[PDB]
Amino acid sequence: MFKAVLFDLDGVITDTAEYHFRAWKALAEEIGINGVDRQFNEQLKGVSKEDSLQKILDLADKKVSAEEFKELAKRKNDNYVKMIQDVSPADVYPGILQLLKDLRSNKIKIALASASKNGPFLLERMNLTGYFDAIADPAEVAASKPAPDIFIAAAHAVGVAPSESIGLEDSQAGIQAIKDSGALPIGVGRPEDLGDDIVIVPDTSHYTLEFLKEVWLQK
């Protein structure tokens, strides 16, 4: 039986992938780049703040100064941080709170494997901090998603091997990170976005302990 679950945050625990998208799209447009639509945004999910900005600049073969790059990343973060101030426990996605309770009651470790530097603040807004045994610090890993490092760090932080863990993700980059960590991925979203080669559920209500057990036994 698996011994840990490694959670992505944005688009898994709550609908903040939507807010990252809106904030990045707004930034892109301010700089005259119009290609950040929902389809392109699938390439941005899971990616660090700096890598996100770079992917956007690349879309338009645009170069900015180092000073401008720093200011643009700050402007997007400042906007995003404003957007999330009113997040509350009411915004926890369906199933997630119950899953945390059920994991905790079955002595399964719970770790956050988020790229977001806003992760701790969001878990506090949602009254979830006390369910997490560890939060992997995304500033500490030498490499970000789709590198596996953040998932490996999350597993190690709760004393479990990645191979004894499930990872939950909504992104292409994050699914790849889980695969390369040795943990078992279960995605949430559309197979058209996340692939047909892993288990994908259509919405978070499917993330029950019963189902995670259902998947572990088979794969």
Ligand SMILES: O=P(O)(O)OC[C@H]1O[C@@H](O)[C@H](O)[C@@H](O)[C@@H]1O
């Ligand atoms: O800018 P932050 O809060 O550090 O977030 C980093 C990344 O965190 C990931 O969880 C999101 O999927 C990305 O969209 C985001 O860019």
Ligand code: ALF
């Ligand atoms: F959506 Al995340 F780390 F929270 F990629």
Ligand SMILES: [Mg+2]
């Ligand atoms: Mg996500």
